[PDB]
Enzyme design. Structure first.
Site, PDB file in Angstrom:
ATOM      1  N   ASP A  66     113.801  49.311  88.429  1.00 28.61           N
ATOM      2  CA  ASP A  66     113.455  49.674  87.076  1.00 28.61           C
ATOM      3  C   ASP A  66     112.824  50.864  87.030  1.00 28.61           C
ATOM      4  O   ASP A  66     112.585  51.303  87.855  1.00 28.61           O
ATOM      5  CB  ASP A  66     112.660  48.373  86.364  1.00 28.61           C
ATOM      6  CG  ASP A  66     113.163  48.130  84.994  1.00 28.61           C
ATOM      7  OD1 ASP A  66     112.766  49.085  84.055  1.00 28.61           O
ATOM      8  OD2 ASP A  66     113.401  47.110  84.582  1.00 28.61           O
ATOM      9  N   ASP A 126     115.478  55.570  87.857  1.00 29.96           N
ATOM     10  CA  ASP A 126     116.066  55.932  86.370  1.00 29.96           C
ATOM     11  C   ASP A 126     117.712  55.982  86.834  1.00 29.96           C
ATOM     12  O   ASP A 126     118.196  56.584  87.725  1.00 29.96           O
ATOM     13  CB  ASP A 126     115.648  57.355  86.143  1.00 29.96           C
ATOM     14  CG  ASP A 126     116.276  57.577  84.853  1.00 29.96           C
ATOM     15  OD1 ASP A 126     117.259  57.428  84.265  1.00 29.96           O
ATOM     16  OD2 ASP A 126     115.674  58.674  84.400  1.00 29.96           O
ATOM     17  N   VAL A 127     118.407  54.953  86.072  1.00 27.35           N
ATOM     18  CA  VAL A 127     119.782  54.641  86.307  1.00 27.35           C
ATOM     19  C   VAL A 127     120.595  55.810  85.604  1.00 27.35           C
ATOM     20  O   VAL A 127     122.013  55.946  86.213  1.00 27.35           O
ATOM     21  CB  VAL A 127     120.321  53.483  85.642  1.00 27.35           C
ATOM     22  CG1 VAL A 127     119.665  52.086  86.391  1.00 27.35           C
ATOM     23  CG2 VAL A 127     120.520  53.299  84.392  1.00 27.35           C
ATOM     24  N   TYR A 169     125.547  51.794  69.748  1.00 24.90           N
ATOM     25  CA  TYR A 169     125.488  50.781  70.755  1.00 24.90           C
ATOM     26  C   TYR A 169     126.778  49.890  71.201  1.00 24.90           C
ATOM     27  O   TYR A 169     127.104  49.898  72.310  1.00 24.90           O
ATOM     28  CB  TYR A 169     124.530  49.715  70.344  1.00 24.90           C
ATOM     29  CG  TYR A 169     124.482  48.481  71.250  1.00 24.90           C
ATOM     30  CD1 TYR A 169     123.533  48.759  72.351  1.00 24.90           C
ATOM     31  CD2 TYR A 169     124.701  47.215  70.922  1.00 24.90           C
ATOM     32  CE1 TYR A 169     123.253  47.602  73.251  1.00 24.90           C
ATOM     33  CE2 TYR A 169     124.647  46.131  71.657  1.00 24.90           C
ATOM     34  CZ  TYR A 169     123.786  46.400  72.926  1.00 24.90           C
ATOM     35  OH  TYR A 169     123.491  45.269  73.745  1.00 24.90           O
ATOM     36  N   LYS A 195     129.021  49.550  74.668  1.00 26.88           N
ATOM     37  CA  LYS A 195     129.631  48.390  75.196  1.00 26.88           C
ATOM     38  C   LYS A 195     130.867  48.237  75.293  1.00 26.88           C
ATOM     39  O   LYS A 195     131.506  47.504  76.254  1.00 26.88           O
ATOM     40  CB  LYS A 195     128.629  47.459  74.394  1.00 26.88           C
ATOM     41  CG  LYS A 195     126.777  47.484  74.515  1.00 26.88           C
ATOM     42  CD  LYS A 195     126.613  47.556  75.951  1.00 26.88           C
ATOM     43  CE  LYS A 195     125.019  47.243  76.133  1.00 26.88           C
ATOM     44  NZ  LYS A 195     124.705  46.841  77.743  1.00 26.88           N
ATOM     45  N   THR A 215     114.976  38.233  73.386  1.00 26.31           N
ATOM     46  CA  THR A 215     114.426  39.160  74.237  1.00 26.31           C
ATOM     47  C   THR A 215     113.970  40.082  73.332  1.00 26.31           C
ATOM     48  O   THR A 215     114.274  40.386  72.333  1.00 26.31           O
ATOM     49  CB  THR A 215     115.533  39.936  75.210  1.00 26.31           C
ATOM     50  OG1 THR A 215     116.396  40.572  74.445  1.00 26.31           O
ATOM     51  CG2 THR A 215     116.456  38.924  76.013  1.00 26.31           C
TER      52      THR A 215
HETATM   53  N1  LIG Z   1     124.169  40.670  72.321  1.00 30.98           N
HETATM   54  C1  LIG Z   1     123.655  41.766  73.066  1.00 30.98           C
HETATM   55  O1  LIG Z   1     124.092  42.845  72.464  1.00 30.98           O
HETATM   56  C2  LIG Z   1     122.685  41.644  74.019  1.00 30.98           C
HETATM   57  C3  LIG Z   1     121.514  40.949  73.942  1.00 30.98           C
HETATM   58  C4  LIG Z   1     120.746  40.927  75.195  1.00 30.98           C
HETATM   59  C5  LIG Z   1     121.058  41.763  76.059  1.00 30.98           C
HETATM   60  N2  LIG Z   1     122.014  42.504  75.976  1.00 30.98           N
HETATM   61  C6  LIG Z   1     122.241  43.341  77.371  1.00 30.98           C
HETATM   62  O2  LIG Z   1     121.761  42.816  78.541  1.00 30.98           O
HETATM   63  C7  LIG Z   1     121.064  43.836  79.007  1.00 30.98           C
HETATM   64  C8  LIG Z   1     119.641  43.362  79.492  1.00 30.98           C
HETATM   65  O3  LIG Z   1     118.991  43.731  78.270  1.00 30.98           O
HETATM   66  P1  LIG Z   1     117.420  42.934  77.953  1.00 30.98           P
HETATM   67  O4  LIG Z   1     117.671  42.077  76.642  1.00 30.98           O
HETATM   68  O5  LIG Z   1     116.989  42.316  79.201  1.00 30.98           O
HETATM   69  O6  LIG Z   1     116.819  44.429  77.313  1.00 30.98           O
HETATM   70  P2  LIG Z   1     115.403  44.859  77.868  1.00 30.98           P
HETATM   71  O7  LIG Z   1     115.016  45.943  76.970  1.00 30.98           O
HETATM   72  O8  LIG Z   1     114.426  43.538  77.899  1.00 30.98           O
HETATM   73  O9  LIG Z   1     115.639  45.374  79.385  1.00 30.98           O
HETATM   74  C9  LIG Z   1     116.328  46.352  79.870  1.00 30.98           C
HETATM   75  C10 LIG Z   1     115.770  46.947  80.999  1.00 30.98           C
HETATM   76  O10 LIG Z   1     116.471  48.156  81.358  1.00 30.98           O
HETATM   77  C11 LIG Z   1     115.482  49.116  81.652  1.00 30.98           C
HETATM   78  N3  LIG Z   1     116.119  50.541  81.441  1.00 30.98           N
HETATM   79  C12 LIG Z   1     116.359  51.008  80.273  1.00 30.98           C
HETATM   80  N4  LIG Z   1     116.795  52.330  80.553  1.00 30.98           N
HETATM   81  C13 LIG Z   1     116.494  52.575  81.847  1.00 30.98           C
HETATM   82  C14 LIG Z   1     116.986  53.738  82.878  1.00 30.98           C
HETATM   83  N5  LIG Z   1     117.346  54.665  82.254  1.00 30.98           N
HETATM   84  N6  LIG Z   1     116.652  53.643  84.091  1.00 30.98           N
HETATM   85  C15 LIG Z   1     116.453  52.302  84.699  1.00 30.98           C
HETATM   86  N7  LIG Z   1     116.309  51.198  83.929  1.00 30.98           N
HETATM   87  C16 LIG Z   1     116.363  51.355  82.373  1.00 30.98           C
HETATM   88  C17 LIG Z   1     114.387  48.821  80.806  1.00 30.98           C
HETATM   89  O11 LIG Z   1     113.101  49.488  81.410  1.00 30.98           O
HETATM   90  C18 LIG Z   1     114.342  47.245  80.582  1.00 30.98           C
HETATM   91  O12 LIG Z   1     113.522  46.630  81.912  1.00 30.98           O
HETATM   92  C19 LIG Z   1     121.411  45.292  78.501  1.00 30.98           C
HETATM   93  O13 LIG Z   1     122.187  46.026  79.052  1.00 30.98           O
HETATM   94  C20 LIG Z   1     121.246  44.677  77.266  1.00 30.98           C
HETATM   95  O14 LIG Z   1     122.436  45.966  76.305  1.00 30.98           O
HETATM   96  C21 LIG Z   1     122.917  42.519  75.281  1.00 30.98           C
END
Ligand SMILES: NC(=O)c1ccc[n+]([C@@H]2O[C@H](COP(=O)([O-])OP(=O)(O)OC[C@H]3O[C@@H](n4cnc5c(N)ncnc54)[C@H](O)[C@@H]3O)[C@@H](O)[C@H]2O)c1
Ligand SMILES: NC(=O)c1ccc[n+]([C@@H]2O[C@H](COP(=O)([O-])OP(=O)(O)OC[C@H]3O[C@@H](n4cnc5c(N)ncnc54)[C@H](O)[C@@H]3O)[C@@H](O)[C@H]2O)c1
Ligand SMILES: NC(=O)c1ccc[n+]([C@@H]2O[C@H](COP(=O)([O-])OP(=O)(O)OC[C@H]3O[C@@H](n4cnc5c(N)ncnc54)[C@H](O)[C@@H]3O)[C@@H](O)[C@H]2O)c1
Ligand SMILES: NC(=O)c1ccc[n+]([C@@H]2O[C@H](COP(=O)([O-])OP(=O)(O)OC[C@H]3O[C@@H](n4cnc5c(N)ncnc54)[C@H](O)[C@@H]3O)[C@@H](O)[C@H]2O)c1
Lengths: 258, 258, 258, 257
Positions: B37, B54-55, B151, B155, B188
């Site tokens: 992360d 950083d991804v 977004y 996706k 979340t």
């Molecule tokens: N229905 C939906 O649209 C939905 C709901 C929840 C999660 N999701 C997807 O599930 C995944 C998890 O999300 P979440 O709910 O845990 O969100 P979150 O924000 O709680 O966690 C996302 C993590 O990604 C990390 N991150 C962001 N940019 C980054 C970068 N450049 N390099 C490294 N790390 C980075 C953040 O620091 C964070 O820890 C995401 O891909 C999200 O889009 C989608």
């Protein structure tokens, strides 16, 4: 974790190639399994109980319900795996052939889920994630095919019935998840029969060319093995799948996505 | 069985709401987990290793590859979980906002899968079922929404990239499965920020009305918990999912199917 | 009736294989057509106006807006037909190649729809059925393919951007319908270049075998002709399609449905 | 896009959508054979009206006999006849599922088999082929509580369409087959569904049911029956020569959010 501790499961078509693998996988995850099939006698590895059962017979379903009621007082998972195929020229197919495929593939789920609904409601009270009904559709319920009108039509009906029952059981507060499973080409006697009948109708020059074409249509490049269906059914029946209802659970080697 | 014995897994975004639950679920199934992360250090429960990562950075991905290469010589599972959202009025959204969401949500998967491909090929030799790449899409990659153009578009791109890579890695004989995951409304901070930003735009009267509408759109009748994503990701990373590639793996409480 | 009386239409990529057929079909339905392409002049049969136009250029789009504003004061229909393809091995594809395909296939729609939004809102006031934005996706936006990652990813992005804009323009009360079109294998120079590049990569034994395989994958049993795209675009641009928005309009000879 | 010299059979022609289909197809210059249960109807633009039970093979043979005698072909066949029920699954006898299947699905099987010789003549008459248009629903794409029988039948219609399109092409018949998926269209059928949903207590009132259904459509309203006509004209036309096995959706965006 993914497990079936204290899950009472009914699995139909349990003596067939996929059915036997479902029962072994569910037992390995600690489910109590009532296995049913057309054979009057069968040694299904991992079954606690075997019953001779025609899934088109309401009386046969009532006998399954009576055993589950007496021994356990609930059903936590119901796997509708019994099913048939035909391969026909549409213009030569009597309406009775459509009806027969519908009776085994669709009416089985309607009758069996109605008969077991009281027991599944008890399942819904036993686990926070709910009772689980798993309906075997097919990639043929997602994508059409020449000479498979009756079969594909029945599998699309199974798929949509699954979406409606998941929505309705949630709206009524029963805590019963309902999902459809979509196998691709699995190496079973049923797939063998479909490819043989396709050659007989002259859809394919030979059984070898039919088999090769079907394999190349799967991005993974081969038929599935019956054992490759087991883990997905265990997952759907488990509390790990508590947020999974109305879903198309695809195990098709990528078939439907290209 | 569904387990991850001797699976070396890389999980990105591992410090987020879903990420922490994925690492715990995969460790509980006996995986070796490399968690990454943005934070320079983190206590991620169940992580064997934590890397600042950083991804969007090829150099960051090479540091992940170097650790896996030195300690294990392979990667069996790669979970692209890092992601961002924005909620915007399209006519007020500069092209650079689309590009920024694309860089984190899509370019991450391209750069990371390219950098780790040699290690994933070694995973493909280690397990008959193959190495497993799991890409986090969304129900927003299946169904559109007002004010979520950037977004949802990113996706849908993740979903289709998953289908193409599953097909291509199979055609090249690499034994690497690739699947997309589609969460529904999961409780979340990301979902909280989307509902808050929807109020700020005046798309919703209040946070309470936004939340109730979103819950009622799910047939199961509630938001998901982050822990409800773990089982599905464990299944996809496991040998039990050996016939699952190019697939849309939906964990959405029925959202997309009504 | 299906007709385009008093419809001011902008068609991009108008000098290409499909583009020329779209302009002829729309003129035959009585549209006023502003045709645009990269060439500094062109004889596009049925065009009222031709403009040199790079769809990646905001300044280019503003010149299109200036002509429509001066001559007509509205745009009733916008057809985003300009598009490119590449065929590549994923592991040999630089990020810049994904970005180039994104810039032409996706950023064109974002920039052009933003620049023409005021004129499309005037179209929304001119017809009860609304202004109509038609985005060219592909069956590659529905189904993945080996060696087409960059192209398919961009076309899935086009598909989803269409759903989000249809929903957003409706929610804001603009009366602008937005739909995606999904051609199958159409006999154009673009399909020719894809099959030639597939041979160069060694994805196909020869151009003849590539073409035969592609034809047999379409249930209708042949490639489409560019003229077979025109009627569908006329329908979507017409008031007959007043209840059609966010939709996937497929013209693929059945490719995606088997 | 026109239907010059197209002999079209349209079932359920006296209903909300059916009346608009006949008018649209006549306006595109089709010859229209219109059929329904009623012995008469305010169907304008029909060249012939036949009383016809789509569940009856004998009824379909009478339709075939008229088209054979007057025209010698059928160029377009629009399976628009249909019924709905709204029920609690656990209280729904198997006979209710079967009745909905008989009208919504068996009609297409029996009618397409009986008319197949005439459709093959249509396949020889037009380069683009004969055209069979099967009315499914957004309920054939997305499930709904209390609509199990109806949605199941409409998913069956959708998939039968894909199989027949593929099969008729493989056999060289030149017959295109497509499914149509209307969203919430303002007809007596949608009215009956909303009323029955209230009776079952799925909705507080008919007013709240209608508002919820409208807000589920991104376009923000129910469709009008006339909004179905152009899509059916397009699919029946030579302009749709590359369209087979397809889901033709006219749903105000319902299915895509
Ligand atoms: N229905 C939906 O649209 C939905 C709901 C929840 C999660 N999701 C997807 O599930 C995944 C998890 O999300 P979440 O709910 O845990 O969100 P979150 O924000 O709680 O966690 C996302 C993590 O990604 C990390 N991150 C962001 N940019 C980054 C970068 N450049 N390099 C490294 N790390 C980075 C953040 O620091 C964070 O820890 C995401 O891909 C999200 O889009 C989608
Ligand atoms: N994509 C495909 O085409 C495909 C291929 C294989 C399997 N499948 C699916 O897998 C499931 C299992 O099929 P299989 O391949 O193991 O075939 P199989 O014939 O080996 O097993 C099917 C079982 O159903 C049983 N059965 C049939 N009619 C019955 C009745 N009236 N009452 C009770 N039992 C009955 C049979 O005895 C058999 O044991 C099917 O439901 C099908 O959906 C799909
Ligand atoms: N199954 C499929 O994937 C498939 C098949 C055919 C067409 N299509 C799509 O249909 C559309 C039409 O393509 P076609 O087959 O006629 O290809 P084409 O190459 O014949 O025409 C495309 C046109 O776009 C123009 N163009 C490219 N870049 C441009 C830029 N920056 N600015 C302005 N114009 C530009 C080209 O000059 C060309 O005239 C494309 O969007 C294509 O992706 C998809
Ligand atoms: N989203 C949806 O679910 C939706 C909405 C509207 C219409 N539709 C479909 O569109 C079609 C048109 O229906 P509508 O809304 O106009 O309903 P409608 O009830 O107004 O018309 C249907 C017509 O079919 C006729 N019919 C019924 N049973 C018959 C039989 N056995 N033989 C001959 N004719 C028979 C009826 O008399 C009626 O005139 C139907 O197939 C319907 O299911 C679907």
């Amino acid at each position: 974790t993914i497990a079936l501790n204290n899950v009472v499961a009914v699995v139909t078509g349990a003596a067939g190639g996929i059915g036997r693998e479902l029962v072994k996988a569910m037992k390995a995850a600690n489910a109590i399994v009532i296995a049913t099939d057309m054979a009057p006698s069968a040694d299904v590895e991992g079954a606690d109980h075997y019953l001779q059962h025609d899934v088109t017979s309401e009386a046969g379903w009532k006998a399954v319900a009576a055993l589950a009621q007496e021994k356990y007082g609930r059903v936590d998972a119901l796997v509708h795996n019994a099913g048939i195929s035909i391969v026909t020229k549409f213009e030569d197919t009597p309406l009775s052939d459509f009806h027969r495929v519908n009776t085994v593939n669709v009416d089985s789920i309607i009758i069996g889920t109605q008969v077991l609904l009281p027991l599944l409601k008890e399942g819904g009270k036993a686990r926070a994630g709910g009772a689980s009904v798993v309906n075997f559709s097919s990639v043929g319920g997602l994508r059409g095919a020449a000479f498979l009108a009756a079969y594909c039509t029945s599998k699309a009906a199974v798929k949509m019935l699954s979406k409606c029952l998941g929505a309705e059981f949630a709206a009524l507060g029963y805590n019963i998840r309902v999902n459809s499973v979509h196998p691709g080409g699995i190496d079973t006697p049923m797939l063998g029969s479909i490819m043989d009948k396709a050659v007989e109708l002259g859809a394919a020059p030979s059984r070898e060319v039919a088999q090769a074409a079907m394999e190349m249509r799967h991005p993974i490049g081969r038929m599935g093995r019956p054992a490759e269906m087991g883990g997905g059914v265990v997952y759907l029946c488990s509390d790990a799948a508590s947020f999974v209802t109305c879903t198309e659970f695809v195990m098709d080697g990528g078939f439907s996505q290209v």
